[PDB]
Amino acid sequence: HWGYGKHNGPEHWHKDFPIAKGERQSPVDIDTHTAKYDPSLKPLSVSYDQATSLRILNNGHAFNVEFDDSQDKAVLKGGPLDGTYRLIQFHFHWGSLDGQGSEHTVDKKKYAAELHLVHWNTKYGDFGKAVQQPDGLAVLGIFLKVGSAKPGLQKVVDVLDSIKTKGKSADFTNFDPRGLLPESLDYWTYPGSLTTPPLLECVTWIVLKEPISVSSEQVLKFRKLNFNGEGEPEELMVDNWRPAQPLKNRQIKASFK
Ligand SMILES: NS(=O)(=O)c1cccc2ccccc12
Ligand code: NA
Ligand SMILES: [Zn+2]
Numbered sequence: 001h002w003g004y005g006k007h008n009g010p011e012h013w014h015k016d017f018p019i020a021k022g023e024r025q026s027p028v029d030i031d032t033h034t035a036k037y038d039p040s041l042k043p044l045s046v047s048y049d050q051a052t053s054l055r056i057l058n059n060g061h062a063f064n065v066e067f068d069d070s071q072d073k074a075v076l077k078g079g080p081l082d083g084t085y086r087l088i089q090f091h092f093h094w095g096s097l098d099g100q101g102s103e104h105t106v107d108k109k110k111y112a113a114e115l116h117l118v119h120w121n122t123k124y125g126d127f128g129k130a131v132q133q134p135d136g137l138a139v140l141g142i143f144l145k146v147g148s149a150k151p152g153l154q155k156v157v158d159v160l161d162s163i164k165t166k167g168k169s170a171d172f173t174n175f176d177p178r179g180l181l182p183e184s185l186d187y188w189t190y191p192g193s194l195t196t197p198p199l200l201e202c203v204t205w206i207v208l209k210e211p212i213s214v215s216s217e218q219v220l221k222f223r224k225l226n227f228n229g230e231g232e233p234e235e236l237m238v239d240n241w242r243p244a245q246p247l248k249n250r251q252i253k254a255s256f257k
Contacts, residue, residue: 026192027103045078060166085119149215152179
């Protein structure tokens with residue numbers, strides 16, 4: 001039922017997922033002036049050297065690149081985190097136009113897209129248990145602006161034609177997610193939620209200050225995907241982003257400045 005249209009989009013979600021109006025929903029506007037620098041925050045540790053990608057899937061909301069998370073191979077730790085979190089999948093949110101697409105905003109600025117690298121806390125043993133816990137997930141968010149191409153994104157863009165419609169998947173081995181990272185790992189962090197249903201409040205958000213640049217042709221290829229299944233009327237996969245939600249009783253911390 002849920003999606004991103006006029007009849008089933010974010011403003012509808014609370015009727016099936018009442019936690020939509022909860023106390024720690026994501027995304028949020030990052031007010032850079034009122035984020036608190038925390039000199040006690042550690043550098044983020046991204047260990048993606050042994051990442052094993054398996055498959056790329058159109059799930060009718062976005063596309064996910066999924067990883068083997070049955071051993072410590074690609075993990076996030078340090079930063080604001082206490083445990084080790086294993087990479088399970090990444091996906092993106094993007095706009096119909098270059099002026100929108102990101103979920104988090106920075107002083108109300110919207111980027112063309114946002115990458116989410118989703119990781120789960122290994123003390124909970126698997127992803128399904130982790131989403132049930134307030135510290136179960138860590139999502140590393142990276143903004144995309146349109147400019148020069150990102151060469152490390154091209155293998156992704158080039159397979160999209162093979163998973164055009166909802167439910168299609170393709171083998172996707174040997175993809176290296178390190179090729180999607182900006183140079184700096186300076187970040188903001190705050191406790192929040194999944195940004196799609198079921199909107200569970202299990203996420204430590206870590207959002208990088210530095211965006212990556214992708215080319216207009218790269219983002220154009222994202223916009224050719226389809227929300228609909230094969231042999232249904234074409235609905236282009238665009239504007240699959242949830243708007244900023246009330247910060248409520250939360251402080252965004254910054255690792256820098
Ligand atoms: N948009 S997102 O909040 O990164 C997100 C999308 C889909 C599933 C997720 C599972 C766990 C954590 C986050 C997830
Ligand atoms: Na294994
Ligand atoms: Zn996401």
